[PDB]
Structure 1
Amino acid sequence: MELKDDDFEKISELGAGNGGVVFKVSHKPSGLVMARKLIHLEIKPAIRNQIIRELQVLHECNSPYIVGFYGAFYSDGEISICMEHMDGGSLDQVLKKAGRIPEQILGKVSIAVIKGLTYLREKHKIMHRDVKPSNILVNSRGEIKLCDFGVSGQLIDSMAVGTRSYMSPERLQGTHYSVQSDIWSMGLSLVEMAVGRYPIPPPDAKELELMFPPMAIFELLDYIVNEPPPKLPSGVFSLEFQDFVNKCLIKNPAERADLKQLMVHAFIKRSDAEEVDFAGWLCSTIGLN
């Protein structure tokens, strides 16, 4: 069934960020509750049809680790992507209320991100391009899914930053990047969620004891690019987890681990075995179920 602007009714606003605003909406004809992302674009009707056309592959992006797609269309200077509503929100939100996310939980998250990337790569030859906590969504059934990945080449073009980057050193330095760059983003996202704040610059020994001005644009980019990468602090995290992120955060992208390797890493094998009530933990910390 086709989706269009007049068949929807706004319920509330889920949030917004840099180029997009997303609403919790009701699709009257079906009764379904959806998340409707609007992207304001001043663009000609030709490239619009290409964006809509390119977004149609979302209909075949079906995975427990990928946010579901309902449909896409254009309204009035807005492109609409309608998707599964995740009632847990994004991980940056849960991080706020949580303060820190337990390592065992991050184990489950890691599994989901890896399987999601792998799915998009193996089944669709798509790289994420934008892995970070707000693009990892969760729900009360304890599912962890990716969204906001680069299916439409043209949409990317029509949008081409913030005061904190999850971009790899190679992507910051030029055009010489690819799927490896997503690994870095994941690594950086996992520290931070683990620690309780964007891990650049790294905390002083005093800042560590407490847990257990904002940096200027160039100073932050220059750090990412030229300073040793961030590490999990010792003692408070398993050696396994430490190695896992160290492998994700190698500056040289060819030496950096790939999805293949990460999938059979000690930390993952260990997390696979662990029985974790994610649904329960999520609802307790953000007060839902």
Structure 2
Amino acid sequence: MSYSYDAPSDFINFSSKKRQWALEDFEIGRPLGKGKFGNVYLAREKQSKFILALKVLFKAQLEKAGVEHQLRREVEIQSHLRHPNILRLYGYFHDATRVYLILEYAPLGTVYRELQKLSKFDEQRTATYITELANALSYVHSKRVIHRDIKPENLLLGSAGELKIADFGWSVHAPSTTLCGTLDYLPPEMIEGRMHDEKVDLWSLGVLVYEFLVGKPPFEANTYQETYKRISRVEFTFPDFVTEGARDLISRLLKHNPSQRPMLREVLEHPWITANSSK
């Protein structure tokens, strides 16, 4: 009847090798870009002469904004993703005042910029991009990666013109009051959709196919209320130059019923995709 066990009852405080990277390992070249917290430069590892991109963030600016924990999580997540169509994060290091991300270098810029210059893409460039993105999305889902919308701004281009999913916009919607609002008031049914199964990403893929081929998203409007209504009622139309095969794929991806959207493997098998994709 004794309750003095041979087991712990003490209070527990739950709040508790090789050559490392160094800044002197890299030659520095021209700046490749700049965000709110990051400064990206062309760089080269000295021993191997290997070209990469070095992103420099300042610890003072990260802590003053309260986004250091978010940056840490992004570095931990991205550095474990290895896929030819996901921008590789080789590693990181830090000194007194700065954090350094050692990144794969994407020489041909973003798809957003390329879409601005060409206005719209032809069926072969589009179908090849979709094959690469479908492959990347399959890898992302198998790793259960929590991610945001894949838009042209989030897509870099490799040396051979292949897609590279980038982690841009990580600081936006990150808990710091945040300017864009957080998720604190959103119910599960509005946030679980992505990650749970493929159907949300398949819809977003359909929007991206349309934007690639047309140059603008299918549901754009002048107000947030009208865009809301067009999406929910699936009110969109095709220009004349969109072919029947493209229409078939986009219309099946943009089904209101998520169960009616074709799986990622069905997208890679679509006759319009296989006919026009070089991948």
When normalised by structure 2's length, the TM-score is 0.69
Partner of 2:33: 15
> CA–CA distance in 2 between the matches of 1:110 and 1:219?
30
The match for 2:159 among 140, 146, 157 is 140
Q: Distance in 1 between matches of 2:173 and 2:23?
A: 23
**Residue 68 of structure 1: how far off its partner (Å):** 2.0
**CA separation in 2, counterparts of 1:69 and 1:181?**
26
**Whole-angstrom CA distance in 2 between matches of 1:78 and 1:243:** 50
Cα 1:129–1:65, aligned 2, differ >3 Å: closer, same or farther?
same
Look up the match of 1:24: 41
Structure 2 contact 92–99 (Cα < 8 Å) conserved: yes
Pick the structure with greater CA Rg: 2
What do the CA deviations read for 1:10-67 (whole angstroms, capped 9, x no partner)?
53333355x55452321454543323445676449x9957854663454442222222
Deviations 1:232-277 (A, max 9, x none): 324x1221111111222223433333323322222223234xx58x
User: Equivalent of 2:216, from 190, 197, 209?
Assistant: 197
Higher mean Cα deviation, 106-115 or 88-97?
88-97
Contact kept? 1:22, 1:35, Cα under 8 Å:
no
Amino acid at match of 1:256: R
Distance in 1 between residues matched to 2:97 and 2:235, nearest whole Å: 41
Q: Residue 112 of structure 1 corresponds to which residue in structure 2?
A: 132
Tell me how far apart the structure 1 counterparts of residues 57 and 172 of structure 2 sit (CA, whole Å).
10
Aligned equivalents of 1:102, 1:112: Cα separation in 2: 16
Where structure 1 has 5 or more consecutive residues not aligned to the other structure, the ranges are: 163-169, 203-214, 277-289
Q: Residue 82 in 1 paired to residue 102 in 2?
A: yes
Identity percentage of aligned residues: 23
- Compare the two structures and name the one with the higher helix fraction: 1
Q: Distance in 2 between matches of 1:66 and 1:228?
A: 30
Query: Normalising by structure 1, what TM-score?
Result: 0.67
| d(CA) in 1 for partners of 2:95, 2:235 | 43
**Which of 116, 124, 138 is the aligned partner of 1:96?**
116
The CA distance in 1 between the partners of 2:173 and 2:220, in whole Å, is 29
Match of 1:239 in 2: 244
1:188 is paired with a residue whose SS is helix
1:138 counterpart letter in structure 2 = L
Distance 1:119 1:73 in 2: 27
Identify which range, 3-12 or 67-76, moves more after superposition: 3-12
Secondary structure in 2 matching 1:246: helix
Map of 1:63 onto structure 2 = 83
Pair 1:145–1:28, CA change in 2 (3 A): closer
Give the drift of 1:88: 0.9
TM superposition shift of 1:105 = 0.9
In the other structure, the counterpart of 1:248 is 253
Residues 78/185 of structure 1: CA separation in 2 closer, same or farther (3 Å cut)? farther
Match status 1:226 vs 2:246:
no
Higher relative contact order (CA 8 A, sep 6+): 1
Alpha-carbon distance in 1 for matches of 2:201, 2:40: 27
Root-mean-square deviation (Å): 3.9
Letter in 1 for 2:190: G
